Amino acid sequence: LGEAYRPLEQRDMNEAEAFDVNAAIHGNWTIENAKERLNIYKQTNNIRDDYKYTPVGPEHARSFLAELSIYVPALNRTVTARESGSNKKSASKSCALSLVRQLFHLNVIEPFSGTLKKDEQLKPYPVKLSPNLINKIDEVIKGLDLPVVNPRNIKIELDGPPIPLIVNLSRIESSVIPWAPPQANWNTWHACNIDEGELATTSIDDLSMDYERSLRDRRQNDNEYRQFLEFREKLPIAAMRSEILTAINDNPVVIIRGNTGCGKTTQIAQYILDDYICSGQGGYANIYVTQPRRISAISVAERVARERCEQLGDTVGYSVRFESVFPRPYGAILFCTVGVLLRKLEAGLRGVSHIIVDEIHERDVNSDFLLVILRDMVDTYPDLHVILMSATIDTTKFSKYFGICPVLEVPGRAFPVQQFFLEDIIQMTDFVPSAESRRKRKEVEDEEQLLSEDKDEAEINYNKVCEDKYSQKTRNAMAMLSESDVSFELLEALLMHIKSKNIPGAILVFLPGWNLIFALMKFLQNTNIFGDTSQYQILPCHSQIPRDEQRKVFEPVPEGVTKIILSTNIAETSITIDDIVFVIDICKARMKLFTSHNNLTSYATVWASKTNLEQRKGRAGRVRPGFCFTLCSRARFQALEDNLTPEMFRTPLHEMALTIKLLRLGSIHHFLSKALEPPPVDAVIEAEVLLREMRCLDANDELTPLGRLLARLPIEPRLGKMMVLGAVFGCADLMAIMASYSSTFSEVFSLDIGQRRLANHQKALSGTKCSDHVAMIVASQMWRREKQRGEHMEARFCDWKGLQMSTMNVIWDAKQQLLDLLQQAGFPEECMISHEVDERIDGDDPVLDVSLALLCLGLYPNICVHKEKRKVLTTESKAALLHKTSVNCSNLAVTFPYPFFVFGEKIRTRAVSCKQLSMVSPLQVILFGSRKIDLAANNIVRVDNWLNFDIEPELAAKIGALKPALEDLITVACDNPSDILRLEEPYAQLVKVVKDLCVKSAGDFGLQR
RNA sequence: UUUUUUUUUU
Ligand SMILES: Nc1ncnc2c1ncn2[C@@H]1O[C@H](COP(=O)(O)OP(=O)(O)O)[C@@H](O)[C@H]1O
Ligand code: ALF
Ligand SMILES: [Mg+2]
Ligand SMILES: [Mg+2]
């Protein structure tokens, strides 16, 4: 017997902001006429709405948003505009312009019927070429049979318009994203057939059998895994596992709303996968989980691997740009950024069973774009499952967008978080701001009193609103504090109060950007208490610090040391930093704005939304109880937006339009009209016109081979087009690194707090070239060799030269990626050989010279002309300054060998600044930095209606005739990437003469300079 | 704290 044994001042600013580059594509509606037209519209249609103004920035860099919405009965539609400007006047003009332009394109208002206003011409710049060079031009023109304008037969040089010297002439089904259920011999993650080893005799059922046996074995026998299961069962979301799985199983789309920390991201993917595994079907599951941020995808993937007692690479993986650990091909979970999933769409999503779109409230352009796609995909493929998740969403709006889908409400949280507002913080600390700080703030305010605009009820001071529940002293003190500026005194007092409680735990401080993070770090490190490394370690957290320093925020500190993390919103959602007990929220966020009509970028520090505050708060109360010190008044909190405005509303759309066409999803307008919030129609029009003019789209708005290639590169299309010519000219390596530098906000050189300019050893990297691009190239060439010697050597080198290590790495990784992608498109290795730049050469350098010339194409229309000292002139002689960070910036009376600079960015501060600058020669501008080359009065050749040249008009026409040939060359290259270094002879000679033309001195024949 | 750097891409 027995069972075991039983047998069988500042005038320039407004003028720079009023500049309007694109009225001609928007009905001739421009800055100076839009407000008046809108006033006429408002009078005709009895519209009482006025501009809503929002202050932006600290008091010392105050700007404004202006918003206006108009309901149009005829369309049953509200048209909204939202724009920024240095003051209310510029913001309201830009706002009115957007609104009028939208109304024009929707046929509610007419085109403007008058002529637009097109003085003081700039002095002509002399240009002369050798007879030898001119002969080569003639040979190329003959060889390519190019039409050339003959200015002998150009009569009127009196008082008429300039005459063109270019003839711009060339010479020669919309699908759904593929999907399928799981299939043998297919890797879902790479979208390719496997063909190797043992999915030869191995079916998906056999795999499933193996996974179930293995999991069931571990469930009984693996103590660590057993413990993790016990832990997991106690999470708030476990109470709804079955209900959630049933909803997912029976519906193509589901929404999960659950509190911060309740278990959405760590658990749901496991619930789905384990439900397949335990039922003998583990091989028929493959789950993508998108996160908005890189740190979230990586961090949560690491956690989920640990909950399963595995190494990344088995059932759990991640993929972010430059860094992937892919899981096994069947029965797996891949965490990624939204952008990665959008790039995977090109190859189809065959074999994906479930897509979890996490933190779906973010409203970045990628997330909204993905929602459009996925809604169409579930309609076409009703067996696909999509799961949308957030703590912080309007479920009704998302449910409606998806045709009404299930909404699952998860109650509870892991641990409580005690919340305090500014009043509470002042009262508990007995804070009073110092005499010094009060005087300094009135001093900055009293010089605003001269430049001040009307203070409207939209600029209430919510620090002077407080209930009498608080002491009179608390109220007086609060009323002394700026809402715009961060009081480091208050922060210190709060940190001391936290210390006095004797509660161990890390402190997480949310700040809008780098500048505040590093200023507060310095401030704290200078104190006796917080500067003592035996008591505190202060860690920054920002996207642009080294990867290893980001990882330090998650890690412990020594015994008795308190961790203070000073972080941007990269730590706002998704992540568990396991030792957080206290959150301090400054209640701000930073946006990068772009106004299309004037080409101005700016950074805006704005009030965070209630959504942002709730996510930030939710970094505590995850592993133990916590505290959230929200540094705004209770009345300010009530006045915060529920959410920040969607990115789709304020971003150029041309990259997304290319993606729409690449993925063959049909019409750009139609696709974007299906967005959760459709973008304003003027931005859609701008995008289409840009892509047509760049030749990415043909006459039928279909993708050209150039457009298809550019849609696949992770850079601005204009930089992509520059790369194609780079390849043709044998300098793709240099072009890639410059494109990469032009595509990151991460800065090359470090400057101290309040440092006015680069040090000499940093400027010296430019050598003789007067070029930020060269300085960056040279820095990269040196850094590259130090990186090869190891981490210590790399860091030491960066400290020695004042380089930002993380920037060097990202520029390199992006550059290598671009080159790999060009190789994949068929361009030969030989066109992207490294060429070391020697910055110390004073004079011509053929490979560098053509490289910098091609920047004029990639960064067009950003050409400026040096006037004196830091002052330059941009298009149509608008004033600007050389950015303080440029190697070319000096307060002394510098003169440059040539006055022309190409630049990466035109930034709006208290002044307009040009940033990322390279000196370029006149022919480089004429050839590559121009759309029009016209003959003006008195034989002056005028480029783009403002750069004047004293050059033989006949010669300018000959040079100009090369520009359409260069476009044809790009067509030839994109038709056959593999043949670009063995061109038919007339194109090979074009390449040669253009190299000659781009030599630095080629326009200086017999000229002193 | 006298504004170089919110994010993100095969
Ligand atoms: N690294 C970690 N250490 C300890 N606990 C963790 C860690 N990561 C997650 N958790 C636990 O799992 C819970 C759920 O995390 P997660 O699924 O990321 O929450 P949500 O997606 O709902 O915000 C956390 O509240 C915490 O209790
Ligand atoms: F909802 Al979470 F971290 F993803 F709070
Ligand atoms: Mg989550
Ligand atoms: Mg002349």
Side-chain angles (χ1 to χ4, degrees), chain A residues 1-117 119 121-1009:
Chain A
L1 266 67
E3 201 61 30
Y5 307 133
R6 211 181 74 73
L8 281 195
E9 311 274 301
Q10 83 125 94
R11 290 179 171 258
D12 301 340
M13 176 56 80
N14 306 322
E15 206 181 323
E17 285 176 305
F19 174 63
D20 183 3
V21 293
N22 58 4
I25 66 169
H26 306 287
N28 283 342
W29 292 113
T30 187
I31 285 293
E32 296 308 326
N33 60 17
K35 259 192 173 178
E36 191 50 22
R37 182 60 185 82
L38 188 63
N39 282 358
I40 294 159
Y41 183 91
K42 289 190 5 186
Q43 101 198 192
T44 302
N45 300 285
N46 302 324
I47 300 298
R48 55 180 299 216
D49 314 324
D50 205 352
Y51 300 98
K52 184 199 175 202
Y53 297 107
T54 311
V56 168
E59 282 163 348
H60 77 264
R62 165 65 73 253
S63 62
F64 290 91
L65 308 185
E67 175 170 300
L68 185 56
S69 283
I70 292 179
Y71 179 69
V72 182
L75 301 173
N76 185 38
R77 210 180 154 181
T78 296
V79 181
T80 298
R82 250 182 294 257
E83 297 294 325
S84 70
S86 62
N87 57 63
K88 293 189 176 175
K89 183 176 175 190
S90 55
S92 67
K93 284 179 183 190
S94 300
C95 175
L97 182 56
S98 168
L99 191 28
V100 169
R101 287 176 170 186
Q102 288 181 69
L103 291 176
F104 162 71
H105 291 302
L106 296 165
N107 318 279
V108 174
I109 80 145
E110 71 304 334
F112 179 74
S113 68
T115 298
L116 302 171
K117 211 197 290 156
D119 210 338
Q121 291 287 335
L122 296 182
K123 190 177 183 184
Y125 188 82
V127 186
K128 252 182 98 102
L129 282 65
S130 75
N132 207 288
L133 181 44
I134 294 155
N135 285 326
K136 290 188 208 147
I137 295 168
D138 292 325
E139 292 171 343
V140 170
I141 285 159
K142 199 178 172 179
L144 281 159
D145 209 29
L146 296 173
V148 181
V149 176
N150 186 344
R152 284 181 194 291
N153 298 36
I154 280 40
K155 301 301 293 160
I156 297 293
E157 296 235 40
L158 15 96
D159 189 348
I163 295 304
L165 303 181
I166 309 174
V167 179
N168 52 333
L169 195 54
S170 180
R171 202 154 46 194
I172 291 165
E173 203 209 325
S174 54
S175 308
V176 302
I177 299 302
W179 182 81
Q183 189 192 28
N185 192 33
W186 184 254
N187 187 304
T188 293
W189 314 121
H190 305 301
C192 61
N193 296 119
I194 291 167
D195 299 318
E196 69 217 306
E198 208 80 326
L199 258 119
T201 208
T202 301
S203 75
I204 303 180
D205 289 349
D206 294 336
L207 274 189
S208 297
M209 281 332 91
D210 292 348
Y211 301 157
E212 186 270 347
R213 274 202 305 279
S214 161
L215 191 60
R216 181 180 67 198
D217 182 81
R218 283 194 252 169
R219 201 177 347 93
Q220 286 174 36
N221 297 159
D222 189 311
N223 188 253
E224 189 185 343
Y225 180 54
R226 284 167 70 73
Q227 279 195 24
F228 258 119
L229 294 177
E230 285 181 1
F231 175 83
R232 288 176 61 218
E233 286 166 14
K234 298 173 184 167
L235 295 168
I237 201 157
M240 277 184 79
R241 175 176 73 80
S242 202
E243 191 185 345
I244 288 157
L245 289 174
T246 293
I248 290 169
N249 203 237
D250 292 354
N251 300 271
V253 185
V254 166
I255 298 166
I256 299 167
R257 206 310 301 177
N259 292 327
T260 54
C262 74
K264 299 176 297 296
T265 312
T266 59
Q267 307 308 302
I268 296 302
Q270 298 194 76
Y271 294 166
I272 298 164
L273 175 60
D274 291 338
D275 191 57
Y276 279 68
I277 293 170
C278 296
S279 80
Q281 299 261 128
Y284 294 96
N286 264 345
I287 301 136
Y288 270 110
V289 185
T290 71
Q291 306 286 296
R293 289 166 271 281
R294 301 160 52 78
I295 194 173
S296 311
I298 292 165
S299 189
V300 184
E302 286 172 335
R303 170 64 182 193
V304 172
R306 273 188 311 260
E307 293 191 20
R308 303 179 78 76
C309 303
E310 292 168 20
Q311 299 281 52
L312 288 171
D314 191 0
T315 67
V316 185
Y318 70 82
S319 186
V320 303
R321 191 185 186 186
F322 310 130
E323 206 188 305
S324 293
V325 183
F326 290 102
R328 72 190 184 196
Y330 299 87
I333 299 159
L334 183 53
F335 289 85
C336 66
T337 46
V338 173
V340 169
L341 183 55
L342 297 169
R343 290 297 184 183
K344 296 276 188 84
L345 295 179
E346 299 164 25
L349 292 180
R350 294 181 198 75
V352 173
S353 62
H354 298 77
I355 299 159
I356 301 178
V357 191
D358 208 354
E359 310 297 7
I360 202 42
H361 67 277
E362 285 271 323
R363 314 309 307 283
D364 60 283
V365 66
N366 284 356
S367 304
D368 285 7
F369 185 79
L370 182 62
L371 294 177
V372 174
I373 302 248
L374 292 180
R375 187 175 63 170
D376 290 349
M377 281 189 86
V378 299
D379 190 57
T380 306
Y381 306 109
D383 296 332
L384 176 63
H385 300 280
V386 170
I387 301 96
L388 286 13
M389 316 199 299
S390 175
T392 231
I393 36 166
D394 182 356
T395 52
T396 298
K397 178 204 204 66
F398 282 87
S399 180
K400 284 185 176 164
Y401 183 77
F402 281 92
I404 316 288
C405 57
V407 176
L408 291 98
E409 287 291 344
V410 179
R413 22 179 324 93
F415 297 95
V417 182
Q418 169 151 38
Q419 191 155 18
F420 301 96
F421 286 91
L422 187 51
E423 295 90 305
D424 302 292
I425 293 158
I426 291 156
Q427 193 148 296
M428 73 186 58
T429 60
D430 205 354
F431 179 78
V432 178
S434 68
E436 280 182 55
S437 62
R438 295 200 297 279
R439 64 170 80 108
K440 178 58 211 281
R441 204 195 81 73
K442 278 184 181 82
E443 166 172 3
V444 175
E445 179 190 330
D446 285 3
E447 76 178 350
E448 231 189 315
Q449 150 175 225
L450 257 58
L451 297 137
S452 148
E453 264 161 335
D454 281 327
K455 261 187 98 66
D456 301 343
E457 295 166 336
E459 292 132 69
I460 288 160
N461 187 339
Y462 290 96
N463 280 351
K464 303 192 180 163
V465 181
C466 194
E467 296 183 276
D468 70 7
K469 298 170 184 178
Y470 297 90
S471 76
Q472 187 54 58
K473 186 179 184 177
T474 297
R475 296 193 299 288
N476 289 347
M478 194 159 68
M480 297 165 207
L481 282 161
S482 177
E483 286 202 282
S484 284
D485 314 319
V486 184
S487 166
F488 291 174
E489 292 180 352
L490 177 59
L491 288 178
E492 183 171 1
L494 177 52
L495 288 169
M496 292 293 292
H497 185 259
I498 289 162
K499 183 188 191 284
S500 75
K501 299 259 188 157
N502 202 41
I503 296 166
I507 305 176
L508 175 57
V509 188
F510 285 103
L511 295 165
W514 185 286
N515 182 65
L516 277 173
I517 285 171
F518 292 101
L520 179 62
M521 186 173 283
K522 266 49 181 77
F523 176 85
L524 293 173
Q525 286 178 339
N526 195 248
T527 63
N528 293 332
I529 302 278
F530 303 100
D532 182 348
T533 59
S534 78
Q535 283 188 103
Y536 293 90
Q537 193 159 329
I538 303 167
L539 300 177
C541 189
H542 191 284
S543 70
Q544 283 154 203
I545 69 182
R547 168 102 189 74
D548 264 15
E549 290 183 29
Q550 298 189 31
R551 137 175 323 290
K552 270 210 189 84
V553 312
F554 294 92
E555 291 164 359
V557 290
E559 172 86 319
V561 181
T562 291
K563 181 162 56 171
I564 296 176
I565 300 154
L566 305 183
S567 184
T568 66
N569 72 324
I570 63 168
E572 171 170 298
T573 66
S574 317
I575 68 173
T576 300
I577 293 164
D578 69 18
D579 56 354
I580 299 302
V581 172
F582 312 91
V583 173
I584 299 171
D585 191 358
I586 273 71
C587 304
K588 311 290 180 180
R590 210 142 201 257
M591 297 188 281
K592 199 192 171 64
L593 308 176
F594 179 71
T595 310
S596 47
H597 73 85
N598 61 19
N599 272 128
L600 279 175
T601 58
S602 59
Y603 277 92
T605 301
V606 301
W607 288 103
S609 68
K610 287 183 173 87
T611 293
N612 301 124
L613 271 52
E614 183 70 33
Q615 290 284 348
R616 290 170 193 189
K617 179 180 175 180
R619 292 12 284 158
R622 306 190 133 259
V623 322
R624 46 194 172 165
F627 304 82
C628 186
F629 301 100
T630 303
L631 293 174
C632 68
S633 68
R634 292 170 174 280
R636 168 57 66 175
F637 179 81
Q638 296 304 335
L640 299 174
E641 294 308 321
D642 290 336
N643 299 287
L644 298 176
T645 64
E647 194 176 18
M648 179 81 81
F649 229 79
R650 55 156 158 112
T651 194
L653 300 176
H654 54 275
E655 293 173 306
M656 200 181 342
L658 275 177
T659 298
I660 291 162
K661 287 286 161 167
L662 179 67
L663 298 179
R664 300 166 300 156
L665 302 166
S667 144
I668 290 159
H669 279 269
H670 181 65
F671 183 95
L672 294 166
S673 70
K674 295 196 294 190
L676 183 57
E677 258 143 289
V681 73
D682 60 325
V684 180
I685 294 286
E686 279 160 5
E688 292 176 304
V689 167
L690 183 153
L691 294 179
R692 286 173 201 132
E693 288 184 343
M694 201 170 293
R695 310 176 73 86
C696 294
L697 299 178
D698 64 19
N700 304 329
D701 287 348
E702 294 305 338
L703 204 61
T704 59
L706 173 62
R708 191 169 298 102
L709 176 54
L710 301 192
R712 290 188 181 116
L713 304 171
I715 49 174
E716 282 281 353
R718 200 183 297 278
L719 294 171
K721 184 164 172 170
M722 175 192 74
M723 288 306 294
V724 173
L725 274 188
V728 174
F729 284 75
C731 61
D733 181 60
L734 285 177
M735 297 318 85
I737 195 168
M738 290 190 293
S740 166
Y741 167 68
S742 298
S743 302
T744 180
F745 306 139
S746 200
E747 296 288 348
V748 170
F749 289 118
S750 60
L751 286 95
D752 193 334
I753 291 291
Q755 213 179 297
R756 78 188 290 169
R757 74 181 73 72
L758 295 175
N760 290 338
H761 57 267
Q762 297 171 310
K763 289 193 177 190
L765 304 188
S766 176
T768 65
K769 310 300 186 177
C770 305
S771 171
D772 289 315
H773 296 86
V774 170
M776 178 277 302
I777 290 158
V778 171
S780 185
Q781 289 169 176
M782 299 166 74
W783 161 85
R784 188 187 51 246
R785 303 174 161 80
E786 305 307 310
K787 176 154 199 92
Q788 284 164 18
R789 304 169 86 187
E791 289 186 358
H792 181 272
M793 294 287 349
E794 192 192 345
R796 188 163 183 87
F797 174 74
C798 291
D799 292 347
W800 205 284
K801 291 310 300 176
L803 302 167
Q804 189 169 305
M805 193 169 66
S806 60
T807 306
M808 306 312 299
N809 277 278
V810 177
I811 289 174
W812 190 261
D813 294 337
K815 164 258 198 189
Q816 296 286 82
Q817 184 180 34
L818 282 170
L819 296 180
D820 293 346
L821 289 170
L822 290 177
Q823 282 195 254
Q824 290 176 31
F827 293 99
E829 280 175 353
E830 290 88 343
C831 80
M832 55 188 82
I833 289 160
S834 283
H835 293 291
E836 287 281 301
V837 172
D838 182 0
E839 74 288 0
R840 303 176 63 59
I841 292 163
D842 198 4
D844 298 336
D845 181 342
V847 172
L848 181 63
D849 292 346
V850 73
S851 287
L852 294 173
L854 291 168
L855 281 184
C856 299
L857 186 156
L859 298 181
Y860 185 79
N862 293 343
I863 306 294
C864 67
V865 184
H866 183 239
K867 190 196 174 202
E868 66 171 341
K869 298 166 186 153
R870 291 184 65 200
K871 298 196 197 183
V872 305
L873 295 179
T874 65
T875 309
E876 300 178 12
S877 302
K878 310 301 175 200
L881 299 176
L882 298 179
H883 192 87
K884 69 175 213 175
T885 241
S886 180
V887 303
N888 298 125
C889 182
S890 169
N891 291 77
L892 308 176
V894 68
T895 72
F896 294 103
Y898 313 92
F900 306 100
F901 289 82
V902 68
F903 64 94
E905 217 173 19
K906 197 168 70 171
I907 303 173
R908 181 183 60 73
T909 270
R910 234 178 93 252
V912 176
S913 282
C914 300
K915 196 179 185 300
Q916 313 189 315
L917 297 126
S918 287
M919 184 174 74
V920 287
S921 335
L923 292 167
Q924 296 172 347
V925 174
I926 291 162
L927 190 57
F928 284 119
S930 72
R931 283 188 79 209
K932 306 181 185 276
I933 300 170
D934 303 333
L935 179 54
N938 281 124
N939 289 298
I940 300 305
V941 168
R942 186 172 297 155
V943 173
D944 291 350
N945 288 296
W946 79 292
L947 298 174
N948 293 311
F949 294 99
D950 189 11
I951 186 179
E952 224 221 316
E954 284 86 354
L955 183 51
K958 287 171 177 187
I959 295 165
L962 306 180
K963 294 166 66 68
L966 287 160
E967 290 293 335
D968 287 340
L969 181 54
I970 291 164
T971 303
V972 168
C974 292
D975 281 342
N976 281 293
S978 70
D979 294 335
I980 59 154
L981 306 183
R982 39 166 179 282
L983 301 173
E984 291 298 343
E985 182 75 338
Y987 287 111
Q989 299 300 298
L990 176 63
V991 169
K992 288 184 197 267
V993 77
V994 168
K995 284 173 182 182
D996 291 340
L997 282 165
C998 291
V999 168
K1000 187 177 277 284
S1001 62
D1004 304 344
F1005 185 78
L1007 287 183
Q1008 172 56 278
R1009 233 93 266 197

